Swiss-Prot record:
EC number(s) on file: 3.4.23.22
Positions spanned in the full protein: 90 to 419 of 419
Gene: EAPA
Sample GO molecular function, one term: aspartic-type endopeptidase activity
Reactions the enzyme catalyzes: Hydrolysis of proteins with specificity similar to that of pepsin A, prefers hydrophobic residues at P1 and P1', but does not cleave 14-Ala-|-Leu-15 in the B chain of insulin or Z-Glu-Tyr. Clots milk
Top-level EC class as recorded in UniProt: hydrolase
UniProt GO BP: proteolysis
Peptidase A1 domain span: 17-328
Protein name: Endothiapepsin
Keyword Amino-acid biosynthesis: no
Taxonomic source organism: Cryphonectria parasitica
Record: active site: 35, 199
Swiss-Prot/TrEMBL keywords: Aspartyl protease, Disulfide bond, Hydrolase, Protease, Signal, Zymogen
Keyword NADP tagged: no
Homology family: Belongs to the peptidase A1 family.
Length: 330
């Protein structure tokens, strides 16, 4: 089997991407944030505290003839951005772009933190990291991909995120028309539960490539590109007027600037992030100071190849017995 679904930016900045997901019988379609940095499929629901729901579409398990309460199971998660959510668990039928899993754990939110409430466009998350990170207790549950894997034509999914435009998540096959040149595969460590890999270096604009190992994770659920302070300093030094602002919480730059591209290495291959991808607009409405899309990972504890990086590539998440990551230009 295979599946294919369109993923759409939630706003004009590509702050995140939503993908329609069918849950239950009859189908209830929710728009979920596909997140290769976490491993819980959780949704706004009929059980979510009413004051914490503000425009989201909810899953109502009582209206699904295939929903079954997973007795005694709870979940609770906290994300890198400080947000969180928690609740109980159902199993139900879940379909993504034509691909169907029966008995998928659907984590129903009883509580969500304010940032989720405040975002009307995201109805929940669909985690695609390794199932070892799943937070369901006392019996850990598998991700949608993990459940689907055996049935897929090939044990892979691909992320093809758009810049200010729709893109595609495919399950079970590689669309060879969706990228240019070749896919370069690179090793993955699953030891922390992430799609963790090592970039071979970087360049700033038309500058010379610096060969240096950068360990980080491929994370569709993170907006920006978080890299070591040395790398980030080298990038923003090429932008007149750019500075790190403690009050804003990262590098800012004059909105009148033209940003240089940023290249990262995948083995001997190179992925080029156009400068425009690195502009995340005014820090506040009407400001002429703009927020940068490349930021320091210092104090995160890990480098993160988030959407800014991933949307410059066609990315293969290869879930073979030994997982690997593939990157192609597009």
């Amino acid at each position: 089997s295979t599946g294919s679904a369109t993923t759409t930016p939630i706003d004009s900045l590509d702050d995140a991407y939503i993908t329609p997901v069918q849950i239950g019988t009859p189908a209830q379609t929710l728009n979920l944030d596909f997140d290769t940095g976490s491993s819980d499929l959780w949704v706004f629901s009929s059980e979510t505290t009413a004051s914490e729901v503000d425009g989201q579409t909810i899953y109502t398990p009582s209206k699904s003839t295939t929903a079954k309460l997973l007795s005694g199971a709870t979940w609770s998660i906290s994300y890198g951005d400080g947000s969180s959510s928690s609740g109980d668990v159902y199993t139900d039928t879940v379909s993504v772009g034509g691909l169907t899993v029966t008995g998928q754990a659907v984590e129903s939110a009883k509580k969500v933190s304010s940032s989720f409430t405040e975002d009307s466009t995201i109805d929940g998350l669909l985690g695609l990291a390794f199932s070892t990170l799943n937070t369901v207790s006392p019996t850990q549950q598998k991700t949608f991909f993990d459940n689907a894997k055996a049935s897929l034509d090939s044990p892979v999914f691909t992320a093809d995120l758009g810049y200010h435009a729709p893109g595609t998540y495919n399950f079970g096959f590689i669309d060879t028309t969706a990228y240019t040149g070749s896919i370069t595969y690179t090793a993955v460590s699953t030891k922390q539960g992430f799609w963790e890999w090592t970039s071979t270096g970087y360049a700033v604009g038309s500058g010379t490539f610096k060969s240096t190992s950068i360990d980080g994770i491929a994370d569709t659920g993170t907006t920006l590109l978080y890299l070591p302070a040395t790398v980030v300093s080298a990038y923003w030094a090429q932008v007149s007027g750019a500075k790190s602002s403690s009050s804003v919480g990262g590098y800012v730059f004059p909105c009148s600037a033209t940003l240089p591209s940023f290249t990262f290495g995948v083995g001997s291959a190179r992925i080029v992030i156009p400068g425009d991808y690195i502009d995340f607009g005014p820090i506040s409405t009407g400001s002429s100071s703009c927020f940068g899309g490349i930021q320091s990972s210092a104090g995160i504890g890990i480098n993160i190849f988030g959407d800014v990086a991933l949307k410059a590539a066609f990315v293969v998440f290869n879930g073979a017995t030994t997982p690997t990551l593939g990157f192609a230009s597009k």
